[PDB]
Amino acid sequence: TRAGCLIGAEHVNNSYECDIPIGAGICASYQQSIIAYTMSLGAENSVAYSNNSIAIPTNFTISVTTEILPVSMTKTSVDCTMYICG
Amino acid sequence: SALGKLQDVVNQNAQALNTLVKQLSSNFGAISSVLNDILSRLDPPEAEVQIDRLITGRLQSLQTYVTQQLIRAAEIRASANLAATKMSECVLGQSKRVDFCGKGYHLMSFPQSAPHGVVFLHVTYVPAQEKNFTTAPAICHDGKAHFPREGVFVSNGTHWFVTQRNFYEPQIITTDNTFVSGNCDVVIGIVNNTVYDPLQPEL
Amino acid sequence: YTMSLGAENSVAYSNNSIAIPTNFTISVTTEILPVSMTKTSVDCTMYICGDSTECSNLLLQYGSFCTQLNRALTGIAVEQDKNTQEVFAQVKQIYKTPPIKDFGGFNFSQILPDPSKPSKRSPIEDLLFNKVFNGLTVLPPLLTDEMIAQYTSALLAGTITSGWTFGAGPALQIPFPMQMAYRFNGIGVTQNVLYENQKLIANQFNSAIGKIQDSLSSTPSALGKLQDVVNQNAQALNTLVKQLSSNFGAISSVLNDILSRLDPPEAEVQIDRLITGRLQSLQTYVTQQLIRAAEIRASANLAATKMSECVLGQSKRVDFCGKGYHLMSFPQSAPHGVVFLHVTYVPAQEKNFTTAPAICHDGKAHFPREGVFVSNGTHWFVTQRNFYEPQIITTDNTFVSGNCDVVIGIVNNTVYDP
Amino acid sequence: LTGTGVLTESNKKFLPFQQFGRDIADTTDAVRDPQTLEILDITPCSFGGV
Numbered sequence: 001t002r003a004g005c006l007i008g009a010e011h012v013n014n015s016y017e018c019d020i021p022i023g024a025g026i027c028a029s030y031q032q033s034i035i036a037y038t039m040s041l042g043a044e045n046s047v048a049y050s051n052n053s054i055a056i057p058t059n060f061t062i063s064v065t066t067e068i069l070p071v072s073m074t075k076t077s078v079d080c081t082m083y084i085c086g
Numbered sequence: 087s088a089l090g091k092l093q094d095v096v097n098q099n100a101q102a103l104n105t106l107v108k109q110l111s112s113n114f115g116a117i118s119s120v121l122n123d124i125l126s127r128l129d130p131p132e133a134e135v136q137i138d139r140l141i142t143g144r145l146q147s148l149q150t151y152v153t154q155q156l157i158r159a160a161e162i163r164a165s166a167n168l169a170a171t172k173m174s175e176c177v178l179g180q181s182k183r184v185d186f187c188g189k190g191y192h193l194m195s196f197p198q199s200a201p202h203g204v205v206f207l208h209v210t211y212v213p214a215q216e217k218n219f220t221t222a223p224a225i226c227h228d229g230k231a232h233f234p235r236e237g238v239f240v241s242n243g244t245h246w247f248v249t250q251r252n253f254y255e256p257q258i259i260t261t262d263n264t265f266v267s268g269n270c271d272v273v274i275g276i277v278n279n280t281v282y283d284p285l286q287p288e289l
Numbered sequence: 290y291t292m293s294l295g296a297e298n299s300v301a302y303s304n305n306s307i308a309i310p311t312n313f314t315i316s317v318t319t320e321i322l323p324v325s326m327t328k329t330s331v332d333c334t335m336y337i338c339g340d341s342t343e344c345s346n347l348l349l350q351y352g353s354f355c356t357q358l359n360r361a362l363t364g365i366a367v368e369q370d371k372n373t374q375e376v377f378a379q380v381k382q383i384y385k386t387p388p389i390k391d392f393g394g395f396n397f398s399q400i401l402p403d404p405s406k407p408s409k410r411s412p413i414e415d416l417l418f419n420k421v422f423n424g425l426t427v428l429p430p431l432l433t434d435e436m437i438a439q440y441t442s443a444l445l446a447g448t449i450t451s452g453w454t455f456g457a458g459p460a461l462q463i464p465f466p467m468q469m470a471y472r473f474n475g476i477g478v479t480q481n482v483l484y485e486n487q488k489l490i491a492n493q494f495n496s497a498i499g500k501i502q503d504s505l506s507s508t509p510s511a512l513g514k515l516q517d518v519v520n521q522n523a524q525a526l527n528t529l530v531k532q533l534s535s536n537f538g539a540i541s542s543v544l545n546d547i548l549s550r551l552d553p554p555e556a557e558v559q560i561d562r563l564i565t566g567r568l569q570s571l572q573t574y575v576t577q578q579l580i581r582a583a584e585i586r587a588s589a590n591l592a593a594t595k596m597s598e599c600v601l602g603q604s605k606r607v608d609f610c611g612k613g614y615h616l617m618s619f620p621q622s623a624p625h626g627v628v629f630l631h632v633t634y635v636p637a638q639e640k641n642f643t644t645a646p647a648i649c650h651d652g653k654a655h656f657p658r659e660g661v662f663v664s665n666g667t668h669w670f671v672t673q674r675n676f677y678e679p680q681i682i683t684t685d686n687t688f689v690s691g692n693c694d695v696v697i698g699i700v701n702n703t704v705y706d707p
Numbered sequence: 708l709t710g711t712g713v714l715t716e717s718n719k720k721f722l723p724f725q726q727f728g729r730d731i732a733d734t735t736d737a738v739r740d741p742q743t744l745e746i747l748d749i750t751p752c753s754f755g756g757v
């Protein structure tokens with residue numbers, strides 16, 4: 001591969017969502033052996049565009065997303081003199 | 087791996103601390119890493135050379151720790167700043183910012199406390215079960231061009247209705263949910279329909 | 290000379306005078322942001338000691354210093370892929386535009402991928418791309434330029450055919466000029482303004498965006514912002530390498546000359562001397578690389594929020610998505626960064642009008658429902674404040690609150706009853 | 708002048724009096740063969756993380 005020489009994984013012609021990234025567009029995953037492939041960026045899709053057509057939702061769903069953010073970290077301190085000279 | 091993001095902070099600091107402590111066992115070229123062995127084994131006029139050698143080594147490792155701790159602190163501060171604005175705009179209000187308070191149309195958020203951090207539960211509205219409809223930018227009516235006041239003009243295949251664009255809910259097109267601007271010879275793609283006048287049934 | 294701060298100007302302020310734009314222009318602003326930087330890493334042992342065994346073993350007396358340095362650079366290298374992914378991968382699916390590109394007169398061929406080229410990049414991206422060993426190594430990105438181009442294409446196709454719905458939910462088709470009409474209402478300009486000027490708008494858009502390709506060909510310092518990132522990292526790397534020729538007080542900078550020229554019991558002093566010098570220079574490199582990485586991360590965070598709010602929506606934030614009233618944005622891929630083309634509405638050709646806060650009518654005070662009350666010198670009209678379009682004042686475009694004895698500056702007129 | 712690496716034929720042309728060349732970082736990039744005067748490039752022996 002561009003990233004380097006990959007030994008023990010087999011090369012397949014099927015793209016998949018990435019799992020363990022290697023680099024240069026190549027990802028690896030475990031099937032019943034380890035494979036390497038060009039990663040997929042997303043599902044294939046198309047919008048049914050037309051100059052006189054619109055889509056309008058008729059039923060909605062409600063979902064809850066969990067977002068985690070760090071705020072603080074352990075207040076570690078050390079005095080230089082005791083650390084160095086005991 | 088749901089809370090890995092807060093765990094990563096704990097792990098980086100735990101490693102930095104443990105590294106700083108194990109580093110004391112390093113001798114940096116001295117005969118021994120332990121000051122008590124060189125001061126008792128080696129005559130003072132030379133022991134001072136090895137003591138100074140250990141100080142340079144240990145002072146450098148401490149300087150390295152502090153420098154990385156300052157950089158890491160900056161990252162945490164930036165996250166804290168984000169959490170602070172996010173709480174004000176997602177919890178104490180309703181942001182209009184896309185994908186700021188999660189994916190979808192933000193309704194409200196409910197914060198939860200976590201060790202060394204905050205977790206936001208974002209409640210969002212998500213469109214679903216859409217259908218294909220035929221549209222027009224305006225309705226032509228006895229020569230005038232009628233534009234939707236708030237929603238869009240759609241057709242179910244036989245009749246024209248006006249709907250809000252975020253939820254299908256068809257209304258008959260009337261003079262109270264449209265407005266007139268210009269005429270039928272200007273708008274591109276204008277269609278011919280009847281606009282209901284709520285007053286006509288009486289007069 | 291003493292610098293000028295801006296042109297001399299004054300606003301023709303008066304307690305009863307307003308200016309209202311009568312004709313608008315549309316322009317495209319180019320905003321360049323760095324997202325990532327070269328994933329440079331170096332191993333401490335080979336950098337410092339090369340192939341000298343006695344150096345390699347002596348270096349163990351510095352404990353974990355090499356581990357800390359190797360770890361810090363690894364952390365940055367990982368962060369660089371995270372920075373790229375969080376900016377470009379805003380989609381669930383890769384969307385494409387239709388074979389028949391009828392967008393109501395709006396020409397996007399400059400920003401959409403060019404199928405005649407093996408790289409399949411847009412005509413503008415082409416300019417963005419064309420203008421910009423001893424223990425060290427550079428690792429490739431997870432997402433190659435081709436994959437970045439595919440994400441960008443998905444975003445443009447989404448933006449053009451489904452507006453912002455592909456961001457919040459499923460991608461729901463909408464006629465292009467109709468989503469533009471929505472975008473006009475979103476800035477306080479009623480949609481009928483677009484429909485009566487659709488040809489004009491499409492022509493202003495097409496010219497404003499075409500000018501981007503021309504401007505970038507004549508302005509070397511257009512993409513300097515991404516080049517500066519490349520230059521700082523290139524200098525840091527080259528400095529780190531040339532620094533190895535420094536001897537730091539040793540008789541020679543080269544380990545192979547001191548180990549073969551000078552007896553071992555003393556050579557170790559000079560080897561240790563070189564290690565201290567080289568370890569210090571490596572520590573300096575890593576420290577600056579961490580600080581620089583933080584700057585890039587902050588930019589990547591900005592690019593990520595800016596894409597979500599400018600491309601997958603319509604922000605209301607002033608000068609966030611460029612100067613003017615934001616309508617929409619079209620991202621373009623660039624080496625180590627992202628370029629946003631911001632399409633904005635700008636007021637123009639304003640005229641002076643006389644105003645009133647309210648109209649007095651048979652004792653009641655009538656306030657405008659949505660626009661403002663203006664006078665052309667003989668008659669009172671109500672207009673939207675972002676575009677002159679006079680309407681007769683009627684009971685359907687005003688509301689009543691209080692009476693004529695309360696409002697300051699109220700004027701006497703006739704309010705039409707349909 | 709010492710070094711280590713892989714010697715390959717160079718496509719570079721040295722002036723008649725030049726014996727070796729250096730890159731931007733002042734590192735030996737190529738040498739002249741002192742007996743037949745062909746120019747040899749010096750590439751690094753591969754290395755990298757595993």
Ligand SMILES: *[C@@H]1O[C@H](CO)[C@@H](O[C@@H]2O[C@H](CO)[C@@H](O)[C@H](O)[C@H]2NC(C)=O)[C@H](O)[C@H]1NC(C)=O
Pocket residue numbers: 242243244245
């Ligand atoms: C479009 O909507 C109209 C109004 O609902 C549909 O017409 C009605 O059809 C029902 C039968 O399902 C009749 O009982 C009503 O009397 C009809 N109303 C009118 C005003 O005609 C119409 O069929 C729908 N068109 C399509 C293609 O679904």
Ligand SMILES: *[C@@H]1O[C@H](CO)[C@@H](O[C@@H]2O[C@H](CO)[C@@H](O)[C@H](O)[C@H]2NC(C)=O)[C@H](O)[C@H]1NC(C)=O
Pocket residue numbers: 226229276277278
């Ligand atoms: C909407 O109704 C108007 C009439 O009010 C139609 O106008 C006709 O346009 C054609 C040209 O296509 C002329 O030859 C006719 O003489 C016009 N009729 C009249 C009475 O002037 C218009 O075509 C209709 N539009 C649609 C889409 O049906």
Ligand SMILES: *[C@@H]1O[C@H](CO)[C@@H](O[C@@H]2O[C@H](CO)[C@@H](O)[C@H](O)[C@H]2NC(C)=O)[C@H](O)[C@H]1NC(C)=O
Pocket residue numbers: 396397398399499
């Ligand atoms: C969109 O704009 C491009 C120019 O950017 C148009 O392409 C040009 O078409 C003319 C013929 O009318 C050729 O002579 C030029 O050489 C083409 N230029 C380039 C760069 O290809 C394109 O036709 C326009 N498309 C639409 C629908 O307006």
Ligand SMILES: *[C@@H]1O[C@H](CO)[C@@H](O[C@@H]2O[C@H](CO)[C@@H](O)[C@H](O)[C@H]2NC(C)=O)[C@H](O)[C@H]1NC(C)=O
Pocket residue numbers: 312313314489492493
């Ligand atoms: C609003 O401004 C536009 C320019 O942005 C005017 O359109 C131009 O009109 C001149 C003639 O005076 C033509 O030569 C140009 O080619 C037109 N440009 C475009 C893009 O169409 C427009 O007429 C002005 N409208 C009003 C009401 O003032």
Ligand SMILES: *[C@@H]1O[C@H](CO)[C@@H](O[C@@H]2O[C@H](CO)[C@@H](O)[C@H](O)[C@H]2NC(C)=O)[C@H](O)[C@H]1NC(C)=O
Pocket residue numbers: 665666667668
């Ligand atoms: C203010 O606007 C009114 C309405 O357009 C102008 O009055 C019209 O003037 C035209 C001539 O240009 C006449 O044909 C119309 O019959 C007039 N309408 C009415 C209701 O009188 C008026 O002149 C404008 N005032 C100024 C100072 O420009």
Ligand SMILES: *[C@@H]1O[C@H](CO)[C@@H](O[C@@H]2O[C@H](CO)[C@@H](O)[C@H](O)[C@H]2NC(C)=O)[C@H](O)[C@H]1NC(C)=O
Pocket residue numbers: 649652699700701
């Ligand atoms: C608007 O109309 C009212 C009448 O409906 C005017 O009221 C007059 O105010 C003056 C004081 O300035 C009194 O002396 C008159 O007796 C009032 N008239 C009536 C019938 O009560 C009011 O002045 C008018 N405002 C303007 C700006 O013309």
Ligand SMILES: *[C@@H]1O[C@H](CO)[C@@H](O)[C@H](O)[C@H]1NC(C)=O
Pocket residue numbers: 011012013
């Ligand atoms: C991929 O397809 C090529 C033909 O284009 C074929 O020769 C090759 O063997 C295939 N590789 C795999 C892993 O199936």
Ligand SMILES: *[C@@H]1O[C@H](CO)[C@@H](O)[C@H](O)[C@H]1NC(C)=O
Pocket residue numbers: 048055216217218
């Ligand atoms: C609309 O029609 C197209 C066919 O042109 C189809 O592919 C698409 O799935 C339809 N969309 C909906 C919401 O029914």
Ligand SMILES: *[C@@H]1O[C@H](CO)[C@@H](O)[C@H](O)[C@H]1NC(C)=O
Pocket residue numbers: 051052274275
């Ligand atoms: C859509 O395009 C067709 C040509 O294929 C044209 O006849 C029709 O009038 C157009 N409709 C609109 C709203 O532009």
Ligand SMILES: *[C@@H]1O[C@H](CO)[C@@H](O)[C@H](O)[C@H]1NC(C)=O
Pocket residue numbers: 301308639640641
């Ligand atoms: C409004 O009138 C003032 C004079 O008081 C003039 O300076 C200003 O340019 C005019 N503004 C416009 C838009 O005509």
Ligand SMILES: *[C@@H]1O[C@H](CO)[C@@H](O)[C@H](O)[C@H]1NC(C)=O
Pocket residue numbers: 304305697698
């Ligand atoms: C503006 O100021 C003048 C005094 O110069 C005053 O007569 C007039 O009523 C004021 N108009 C308003 C709306 O305040």
Ligand SMILES: *[C@@H]1O[C@H](CO)[C@@H](O)[C@H](O)[C@H]1NC(C)=O
Pocket residue numbers: 741742743
């Ligand atoms: C090396 O020896 C050959 C004879 O085989 C001679 O032709 C050549 O010039 C010599 N090279 C140098 C640098 O003297």
